[PDB]
């Protein structure tokens, strides 16, 4: 949990526009990453936080290692939701960014929004899922996107991945339905999961 | 953004800087590193003064899966406008020897950075061809023969 | 209570308090960022003067050639300078105020030529052009000089 | 009148004024979220402005060449179509940094007479015939601004 | 004594070279302030790679002119891309005089001498460079004390031998007194060629 | 509220019509308006016959142009009012819907820090024109033609479904005039960038 880098990957699609969430969703995933940007940061102030998007035609960088909230709620506002989820890229281009980090004693975590269907097979995923805990990283996957039309496939890859590792891995469930996105990451573990040795 | 920038005239410290980061970040055997290109622009002569290394990282599994580091991009900006006011973003350097398409993408990121279609300049560093140790490029956007889409 | 609606409209009423607080924070956030804007500017403009560097001037002496012009400094001695291409060579002419580098010592671009200040103080008199009629009278005169 | 209480009891039921209610708690989050953005861009300038600032202090440290200004010629860009300089060349629409038209004329004492691009921080305003200035001692730009001289004649004047 | 203290060869390469006139020939008249980073070697050989010109400033060369801010904003971003180096001294232009250090030169080469006795102070004059070894020269403290007792020769081996001073002036009396004088050379590989 | 609207509008049409309907109110419900655009494209191709695509758009259009994008809501309405023989009827539509579109841009868009909006008049523009071509008013669709190129050159970034249409609405001028040759080359821009 503590001494921990994480790279967000906050899913930005054409699915965030419409009422889910008060106002619109895009804006509650605003809320909810200042949420887990600031916890982390409060918990170990060595802790720092990067940013991609699952949006456009590749992922892009919205945000470098950072432990400024001002330049993180930056990216979050001015990201757009004309993009398109890239799951597997984006997990790809975490491993290049968490191959190098401030302090090299920091453990590797994605967190990733789903918000939206997939665009990548389930079998690449599995494949990958083998490639994540060789470079011991923890994936955690945000779910509330899976299940908008969709049987959900994102337990397969968490239970693939997990192990004793250097964390945990960890499999939140949110309700799509309005109960308020920043608060449903609070009552799931965020800081209540603990990293294994 | 800009539209003259027709000829590209380049400094003999250029090739020379671009050789050097080459070789001494030892990204080797087709391991390309991106470094800004700076200078004067807005006009048809684009002198390119100044060029530097910044922090890249490349993959091999899927070749459109790479980092580039926009913090540092920043810091470099702020310095060097003190050393010369003559050095603003004109663009960014590959280290080739080839074009790749996946340089297509990275192009995106230095239209946003700076208001002019940037140059994207090839460095020979591994010098095959006896001509041509510098090639200039522009990404522009245009209408394709054969029926085909506005590419880029 | 009757109803717990009473209770709740007072808390309801701090949430109209605080758009009304707020609403002008941020348009006050953005006055501030062109204040300094312009702040930054006048501080940026002053390295980029640093960088410009100062000049010499001279006056075209005498005509060479349209490769080379004698000029005579202000700073004293006569010299011959080259041109840049950054100063028209077609309005490089005997008599034309120039201005040059010191690094190089080379015309870097044609000024006017200014004047010798007792013959400003007789251009100057001038009152920016006036009108047509300003003569009472004499009218047959009038027409001469037109 | 003022909304979010009795008065609006009688117009709008107590589930429907509960329900307007419900709407404004999540405007005052998502004021918050742009607020505490443009509250950043603040601090970066911030920065900047004070790290510019000690590269022109040095400058207007001690000592510093005394001169006057003979004159002012001020020229804007698009002075043709291009420039603020009156020659012919492609671009480079610049103040004065390499299109030069706005300059000041200064007389030096150092036996000189020099036209220097105009400084950023000297106003067009503080720069007229027969001011006295700073020029800066390492490179002629216009540094700074001085008081007037006086003599013994000035005093029985006043 | 606990140093051979015999006056490096020193050997710039093409890319720095480049470097180090741009910004002095820039910068007339004004004195450019710079430091050099490469890697000493030896106890003869210094080799740059590159320099860095740090900004300039209105208060010349001093001790007070070196600026700690801006020289490890410089540092860290080198470490950062993998392509670190350090100091081996540092360079600065005379806008038209000679190469020599003035005593106040000789205290902003001081400081780099603390780090490492094989500091140089490099000067460059680019109103009279119309070739690249011209008027370019490089310069390093000699201890104080060698110089009562007579040691002050002592860079004669280790060395070809062979010393090219330019000009009477400032130069004879700061070489009695405080610094040893040579050649700079020049390298470069074939890629560059 | 709407609900009413929809179940006149499905007793109207045809049983293989019927899915559709049930989908739009199936989609309401879950909540996700997005799923809502795309089934109601497919209903406008085959039900453009029908004078029913005249009622059914409004009702969705005049609640989400922001819980559906810009292109949504004109891919509607190139749809509805195209077999139109009433021109009067026609303008009106555009009109109210350019104003819309103008007052959304200044609101959304500081809430959200995100989505433009001015996107949107552009393709409008088009649309008139296209409107006074039809009335024989050749002439004066010109010049609207001459004002939204202008527009386009201040974009350095500009669209390829936004200059399909324009490139579209100027093919079909040349030919009402009869010239072979301004046709041809317009057309092959047309056809290219489809």
Redesign the interface.
């Given at each position: 949990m503590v001494l921990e880098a994480t790279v967000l990957v906050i899913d930005n699609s054409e699915y965030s526009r419409n009422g889910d969430f008060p106002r619109t969703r895009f804006e509650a995933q605003i809320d909810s990453v200042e949420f887990i940007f600031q916890a982390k940061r409060n918990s170990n102030p060595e802790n720092t936080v990067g940013l991609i998007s699952g949006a456009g035609a590749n992922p892009r960088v919205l945000s470098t290692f950072t432990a400024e909230f001002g330049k993180i709620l930056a990216g979050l506002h001015d990201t757009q939701i004309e993009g398109k989820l890239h799951m597997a890229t984006a997990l790809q281009i975490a491993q290049l960014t968490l191959k190098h980090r401030q302090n090299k004693v920091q453990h590797q975590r994605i967190v990733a929004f789903v918000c939206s269907p997939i665009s990548d097979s389930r079998d690449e995923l599995i494949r990958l899922a083998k490639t994540l805990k060789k470079n011991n990283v923890a994936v955690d996957i945000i779910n509330f996107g899976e299940i908008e039309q969709n049987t959900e496939l994102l337990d397969e890859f968490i239970a693939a991945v997990n192990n004793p590792q250097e964390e945990t891995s960890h499999l939140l469930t949110v309700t799509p339905g309005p109960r308020l996105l920043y608060e449903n990451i609070a009552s799931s573990p965020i800081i209540l999961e603990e990293g294994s040795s | 953004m800009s539209l003259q920038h027709e000829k590209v005239t380049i400094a003999p410290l250029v090739l020379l800087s671009a050789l050097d980061h080459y070789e001494r970040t030892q990204t080797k055997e087709n391991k390309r590193c991106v470094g800004v290109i700076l200078g004067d622009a807005n006009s048809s002569t684009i002198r390119v003064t100044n060029s530097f290394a910044l922090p890249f990282e490349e993959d091999e599994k899927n070749s459109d899966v790479w980092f580039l580091d926009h913090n540092y991009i920043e810091n470099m900006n702020e310095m060097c406008k003190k050393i010369n006011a003559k050095e603003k973003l004109i663009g960014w350097y590959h280290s080739g020897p080839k074009l790749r398409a996946s340089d297509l993408k990275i192009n995106e990121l230095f239209k946003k950075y700076t208001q002019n279609n940037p140059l994207l300049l090839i460095v020979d560093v591994k010098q095959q061809g006896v001509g041509l140790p510098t090639d200039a490029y522009v990404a522009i956007e245009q209408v394709k023969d054969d029926g085909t889409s506005t590419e880029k | 209570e009757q109803?717990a609606?009473n209770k709740?409209?007072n808390?309801?009423?701090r949430?109209?308090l605080?758009?009304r607080r707020?609403?002008d924070?941020?348009k006050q956030?953005?006055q501030?960022?062109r204040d300094?804007?312009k702040?930054?500017?006048?501080?940026?403009?002053?390295?980029?003067?640093?960088?410009?560097?100062?000049?010499?001037?001279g006056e075209v002496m005498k005509e060479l050639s349209e490769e080379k012009y004698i000029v005579k400094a202000?700073?004293?001695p006569r010299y011959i300078v080259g041109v840049r291409?950054?100063?028209?060579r077609s309005?490089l002419k005997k008599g034309v105020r120039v201005?040059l580098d010191?690094?190089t010592l080379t015309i870097?671009?044609?000024?006017?030529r200014?004047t010798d200040p007792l013959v400003y103080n007789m251009t100057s008199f001038e009152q920016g052009e006036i009108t047509f009629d300003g003569i009472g009278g004499l009218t047959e005169q009038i027409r001469e000089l037109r | 009148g003022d909304d979010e209480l009795d008065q609006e009891i009688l117009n709008l039921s107590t589930q429907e004024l509960q329900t307007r209610a419900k709407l404004l708690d999540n405007e005052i989050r998502i004021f918050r979220s742009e607020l505490q953005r443009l509250s950043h861009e603040n601090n970066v300038m911030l920065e900047k402005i004070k790290d510019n600032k000690e590269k022109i202090k040095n400058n207007r440290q001690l000592p510093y060449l005394v001169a006057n200004v003979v004159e002012v010629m001020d020229m804007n860009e698009i002075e043709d179509k291009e420039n603020s300089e009156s020659t012919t060349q492609g671009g480079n629409v610049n103040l004065d940094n390499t299109a030069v038209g706005k300059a000041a004329v200064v007389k030096t004492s150092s036996r000189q007479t020099v036209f220097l691009p105009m400084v950023g921080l000297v106003d067009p305003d503080k720069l007229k015939p027969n001011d006295l200035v700073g020029v800066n001692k390492d490179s002629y730009l216009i540094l700074d601004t001085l008081p007037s001289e006086f003599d013994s004649r000035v005093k029985a004047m006043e | 004594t606990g140093r051979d203290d015999t006056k490096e060869t020193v050997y710039i390469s093409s890319i720095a070279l480049l470097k180090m006139l741009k910004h002095g020939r820039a910068g007339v008249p004004m004195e450019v302030m710079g430091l050099m980073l490469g890697e000493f070697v030896d106890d003869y050989t210094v080799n740059v790679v590159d320099v860095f010109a740090m900004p300039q400033s209105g208060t010349g060369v001093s001790v007070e002119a070196v600026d700690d801010v801006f020289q490890a904003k410089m540092m860290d971003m080198l470490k950062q891309t993998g392509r670190d180096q350090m100091v081996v001294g540092w360079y600065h232009s005379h806008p038209g005089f000679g190469c020599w250090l003035s005593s106040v030169d000789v205290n902003t080469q001081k400081s780099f001498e603390q780090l490492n006795s094989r500091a140089v102070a490099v000067v460059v004059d680019p109103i009279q460079s119309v070739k690249g070894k011209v008027v370019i020269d490089a310069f390093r403290l000699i201890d104080t004390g060698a110089l009562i007792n007579n040691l002050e020769p002592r860079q004669t081996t280790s060395n070809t031998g062979l010393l090219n001073k330019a000009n009477i002036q400032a130069l004879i009396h700061g070489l009695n007194r405080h610094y040893y004088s040579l050649n700079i050379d020049y390298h470069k590989t074939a890629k560059e060629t | 509220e709407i609900d009413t609207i929809l179940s006149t509008l499905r007793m109207e049409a045809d049983p293989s019509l019927h899915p559709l309907f049930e989908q739009f109110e199936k989609f309401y419900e879950e909540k996700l308006w997005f799923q809502l655009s795309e089934s109601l494209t497919k209903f406008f191709d085959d039900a453009k016959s029908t004078p029913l695509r005249l009622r059914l758009y409004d009702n969705f259009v005049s609640k989400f142009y922001d819980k559906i994008n810009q292109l949504s809501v004109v891919k509607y309405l190139l749809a509805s009012l195209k077999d139109s023989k009433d021109f009067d009827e026609s303008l009106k539509y555009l009109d109210d819907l350019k104003a819309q579109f103008q007052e959304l841009d200044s609101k959304k868009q500081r809430n959200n820090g995100s989505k433009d909006h001015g996107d949107g008049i552009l393709l409008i523009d088009s649309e008139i024109a296209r409107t006074y071509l039809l009335k024989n008013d050749l002439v004066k669709a010109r010049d609207l033609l001459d004002d939204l190129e202008k527009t386009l050159d201040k974009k350095d970034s500009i669209p390829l479904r936004i200059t399909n249409s324009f490139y579209s609405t100027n093919s079909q001028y040349f030919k009402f005039k009869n010239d072979f040759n301004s046709f041809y080359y317009t057309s092959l821009l047309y056809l290219s960038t489809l």
């Open positions: - | - | 109803e609606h709740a409209l808390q309801f009423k949430k109209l605080e758009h707020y609403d924070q941020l956030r953005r501030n960022i300094l804007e702040l930054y500017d006048k501080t940026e403009n002053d390295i980029k003067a640093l960088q410009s560097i100062g000049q010499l001037i202000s700073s004293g291409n950054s100063v028209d309005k201005t010191i690094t870097m671009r044609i000024l006017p200014e | - | - | -």
